Ligand binder design. Structure first.
Ligand SMILES: C[S@@+](CC[C@H](N)C(=O)[O-])C[C@H]1O[C@@H](n2cnc3c(N)ncnc32)[C@H](O)[C@@H]1O
Ligand SMILES: C[S@@+](CC[C@H](N)C(=O)[O-])C[C@H]1O[C@@H](n2cnc3c(N)ncnc32)[C@H](O)[C@@H]1O
Ligand SMILES: Cn1cnc2c(=O)n(-c3cccnc3C3CC3)c3cc(Cl)ccc3c21
Ligand SMILES: Cn1cnc2c(=O)n(-c3cccnc3C3CC3)c3cc(Cl)ccc3c21
Ligand SMILES: Cn1cnc2c(=O)n(-c3cccnc3C3CC3)c3cc(Cl)ccc3c21
Ligand SMILES: Cn1cnc2c(=O)n(-c3cccnc3C3CC3)c3cc(Cl)ccc3c21
Lengths: 373, 378, 383, 339
């Protein structure tokens, strides 16, 4: 049993831009961007609920800006792709209900106390687990094929799940292959199952997963239910921050529990999560580790981190005491300085709402810092 | 040296997210009382003077959502405008629909009923406490419970339902297991009224609550206490915040330990693997820990919609066992049948026992079928 | 002669008008409840706007009703079944905020009360009116407006004019001549029609079709001349209509429902209310009294007013005005009404079978003037 | 030769009037920053919920939460014990923020110095008196909600009506759980009714239905849903004259439902005050008629012989004042100034 004594399976899932939870996350980030464009100091905590023909915004937004919530929500939904009743949703005729408590208004304190985890594994060039990377890439490929007209029977909603067979390597993980792949994408009433499954197997899966991972034993659950036509908000309710694991690492590492979308820099469960990801990516890309996890706990009012811990999974020459000292030397994790270090006042947050907050190049927390130790 | 710190959070029954969780589980119980086969997925949104139920509930039951919601809120303890919420005059909007027929397509025999949705779900058990749960989450939940108890019996009449008790503990490693040494930090921030002064609340929380919950062997003289760190916290509950079902998933399970599959528990019946499979994985982990096989174990299962059997199962005993994960997996397969249709029979997931789980964690409490270990036969 | 004649206008709105959408949905909920619990106490208001139907009110009943199904079936019957039309029953949002009837009213009205002597469901004044200028004993203007809307709906539904859409609004101005207290309609001075349509049809086509296929098939040639004024689609485009482009509420078209300005109104909405609410029961009873007086030969044009106070079964006040078209002074007519008509809610419910689910039929095209309803059946007067 | 006529009114706390006042408050909030604002606002009040729907095209930036809560506070709902609380009520804004027909009636009767029917005048006065006694602490057991009804006995004078006496009065005002029925019915008779209705109209045969329900503790939006424009007859004449069916509250000048009703009232009051008539009705319709009830020396043909804003200043934020206690019969409004 040499094969299975150092081998395991790990699953991770992702959801496309049409998934109602992701509709809500993207709309929340759209509102946050709309406010940040005019008032970079806006204090925004927005929560979105998507149901059959209904978008509900609720939360606290104290800012000097004047935002057209109808326009923002409808433009976000249109960009998602829902523009007809035949698809189960229509930005033109959807209902937007605004319940925001807008009110006229470094060592800033934290927004609330929270656990926040960052994690970096060098098994991919993006320093992220392979399972979530593949799931996000599959959803992105489905969206790309739907939007350019290659497969007109696709619809915005979709859920993907990749099970990857891994082998341990002195504290790190190396992906051997792809044991299973599940795809469930909303479609129209015209196309038949055979065509859909053939297209998903050939045009989508084989154009994303390198052939060195797919072999003849791979298991394919393509449209396992057999009919996915009623989808989007019609087929399920959605809320902001209900897909937190899909956002960060798809199971790997850990999660403090705080949602990301809809929150500005002062809400520490977003800015500090970004800072912990920055620390972990810096340690991994700085050569110190090969797989690192950083836990940071902040308290409300109190500015400085209330607790910090590191776990390198035994992949470093430095006991995580030394790594923690390095993190203190190089990284100032107060929210007031995290803002300046990561430019968290820019309207660059909707880009993070779909296909994961991490592993994408264009984000300041994805640029490792030069560590001096 | 082998010493680290770990934090874990918990929120009281008044926290808006937990208001939503309790209301969702109350609707689920109301349906399960009349229709054990009810298919329920009920998300809840709570904010100033508004409770909104949205989701899909297909069942033969006839439920009065107004009474369910208002009695849940009353039991929480919000019964006056001075507290920021009032069950009598709160607004309940019902946007419930029928389960999508496409999902009902994937009808069939019970024993091989397919998964209600795909996804990965984790279980975890560490024997550092008699409940096989991490110490930090246990202490946070007990602090919230003590605050609720003191508020409800009139010992401290200036308390109010919302609270957030949330603790940092110092740990030492020992051959893959963790032993808690002391409580490094404790943060308490509980809603109160205007007439009470800050010094009195901080003294009472230090003496009345902390000393009656945390064993003295953990509290040292160097312990850091952040009691009401934000001065006044009078505006709380759904007012001055917003809630949603399943937005406190980590608070529910292990407070950061192990891992989470991202799936919310509250509002879902047995067909939703997000809840049934999480309960089954917790059962497997507690069975392995209590069975002596390991001192600290993590289990992962994954499902695909319409496929009854798990797509993948994995174990990680953290190096605290004589048995490699391969033969632990074999033990789990021989002893545990993890299909939802057999999980429902084994854990009696059709009983209206779900609101009790909505507050103070789904695990670590003895009265639940998934918290009684199985007799392992290997 | 312009000196001895006058003009009177009256408007009406089609089944697609958001206010009528709300009225029809409220009556649909009332019918759904009355089908199972004839004693259901229902007071439902509906608010319809783009992609949202909201039911708010008090419903105390033993029935179990699927509000989603009722609302969506009502909307489908109205004709909104695609986003291109601005509304879709499949994907519209239905929010239910219904509660139980307040116990105060329950104890003050009907609890522990015999049927014949249950107090008024609420205070207020209610009017009835009958004019013999039409066989339906209704003014010609409102009759013509309702018939124009009905013809538009009929043409849309059978596919004759596929470019029509559910929303519409007609308004007929009629030239009357006074005749010893009564009114005789001479001709139709003006007609304005504005019906929702699609983007691909040209304005001239719609104007010609409305002139020829709709108006000519409804208004008798006796009333149409070459001097009649036609405002057919006077606002160019009417393509963004229905709940989108205009909000709606229950009971916001009360005058369209009863007489289109003739007589008077007590301000009380009809839709969504059961027999205990005098706003509906007493209005129906006053219409019954007025039509009985007109059809019984006593008058040619009559108005009746009743008033109630919550918890008091008997009317507080009753008044008649025959417009000087009778041999009997209003005292005599009022004594006839008292002798022959019993206007308590508890006896009205039995005399008009107000417990049957026949209320959605009244939601569109007016509550009166249609023979299918008990209050439109004159009673044999005995004096 | 006499007859009876009833008319009702509703106090500031009535849920329909809560909605009307909130709609007019939103309209005012817009008109203060953009005189050309195009507003059509519908309001719905239910247990602990205020919902704003409709369409507003304007350059103004308005805080709907603040406007609604301040209006509700001015109404008097500031505690759950009263069934509503501006602090914790839910305001849902469904307004369609945008990119910048019908028949109407007017009527005037000189039976009162305000050129309005006596019944609606007395009903509005009774509601106002209840509000005053509730707000100055004279009767602390009163709550904002209230409904009043006056049945007056009239006699005819050559096509004109002259009131004789008040035949019936009904008062139903929300109270608290403490006061007893005897105290409420004595106070509503001696302190409210006797201070409003002149004694020449009240005699020993008058019928008093004071608190006919017995218990009216649950009231306001909790006890009944409300909507904008559901009390249109209470707004104008309480049954007298006629109504075109169009609601007033929430609409700016472009909506003939409001501006044209004001213009028709102006015409009717001008004819009555100018001496031509003693009781006149005017009927207009957009995309004209008169009936002087036989109280003029000249037929309706000689009496019949978008520019209103310039003459009525319909762009000024003076609209919430009209939301409660009737749109007419009050001195301060420009349409109540005969020309
Ligand atoms: C099946 S439920 C999942 C949890 C629970 N059933 C509920 O309603 O909340 C909704 C999710 O399933 C997916 N879904 C809906 N219809 C589906 C179908 N016919 N086949 C596969 N997935 C579907 C949607 O993407 C949505 O995220
Ligand atoms: C038309 S009734 C209908 C109320 C409820 N939806 C029902 O079905 O019974 C509503 C009116 O009754 C009035 N009201 C409520 N409680 C009352 C009471 N106890 N006594 C007298 N009037 C009351 C309120 O002012 C409100 O305007
Ligand atoms: C083989 N293997 C090598 N490294 C890991 C690992 O980091 N996790 C894991 C995943 C998510 C969260 N936490 C963990 C750590 C085990 C705590 C695993 C979890 C499972 Cl179920 C099974 C195997 C592993 C594993
Ligand atoms: C000292 N130590 C001993 N065991 C653990 C452990 O299981 N986790 C942890 C917590 C939550 C999720 N996953 C893990 C495992 C490290 C993957 C830690 C996480 C941090 Cl930040 C710091 C220290 C530890 C640790
Ligand atoms: C010529 N003529 C003959 N009978 C009537 C009549 O009953 N009303 C009317 C309409 C609606 C409500 N009330 C009335 C009566 C006049 C009180 C009219 C209203 C106007 Cl604006 C102009 C003329 C008439 C008329
Ligand atoms: C005695 N009397 C003298 N003038 C009038 C009068 O203008 N109306 C009335 C009220 C409201 C609307 N329209 C009218 C006119 C009769 C059409 C009455 C309505 C009734 Cl029920 C009973 C009597 C009168 C009356």
């Amino acid at each position: 049993a040499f094969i299975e004594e150092g081998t395991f399976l790990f699953t991770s899932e992702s959801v496309g831009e049409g998934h109602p939870d992701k509709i809500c996350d993207q709309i929340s980030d759209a509102v946050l961007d709309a406010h940040l464009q005019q008032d970079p100091d806006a204090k925004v905590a927005c929560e979105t609920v998507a149901k059959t023909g209904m978008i509900l915004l609720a939360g606290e937004i104290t800012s000097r800006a004047a935002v057209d919530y109808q326009k923002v929500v409808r433009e976000a939904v249109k960009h998602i792709g829902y523009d007809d009743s035949s698809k189960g949703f229509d930005y033109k005729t959807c209902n937007v209900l605004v319940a925001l408590e807008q009110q006229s208004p470094e060592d800033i304190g934290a927004g609330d106390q929270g656990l926040m985890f960052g994690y970096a594994t060098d098994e991919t060039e993006e320093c992220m687990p392979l399972t979530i990377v593949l799931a996000h890439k599959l959803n992105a490929k489905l969206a790309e094929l739907r939007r350019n007209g290659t497969l007109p029977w696709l619809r915005p909603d979709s859920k993907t799940q990749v099970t990857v067979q891994y082998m341990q390597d002195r504290g790190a993980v190396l992906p051997i292959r792809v044991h299973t792949i599940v795809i469930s994408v909303q479609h129209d009433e015209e196309v038949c199952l055979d065509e859909m499954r053939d297209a998903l197997k050939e045009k989508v899966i084989k154009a994303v997963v390198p052939a060195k991972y797919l072999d003849e034993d791979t298991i394919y659950h393509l449209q396992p239910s057999g009919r996915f036509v009623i989808g989007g908000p019609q087929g399920d309710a959605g809320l902001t921050g209900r897909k937190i694991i899909v956002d960060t690492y798809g199971g790997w590492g850990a999660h403090g529990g705080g949602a990301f979308s809809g929150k500005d820099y002062t809400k520490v469960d977003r800015s500090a999560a970004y800072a912990a990801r920055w620390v972990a990516k810096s340690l991994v890309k700085g050569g110190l580790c090969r797989r690192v996890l950083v836990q940071v706990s902040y308290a409300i009012g109190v500015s400085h981190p209330l607790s910090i811990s590191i776990f390198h999974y035994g992949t470093s020459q430095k006991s995580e005491r030394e790594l923690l000292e390095i993190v203190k030397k190089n990284f100032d994790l107060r929210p007031g300085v995290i803002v300046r270090d990561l430019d968290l006042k820019k309207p660059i947050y909707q880009r993070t709402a779909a296909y994961g907050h991490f592993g994408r190049d264009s984000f300041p927390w994805e640029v490792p810092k030069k560590l001096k130790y």
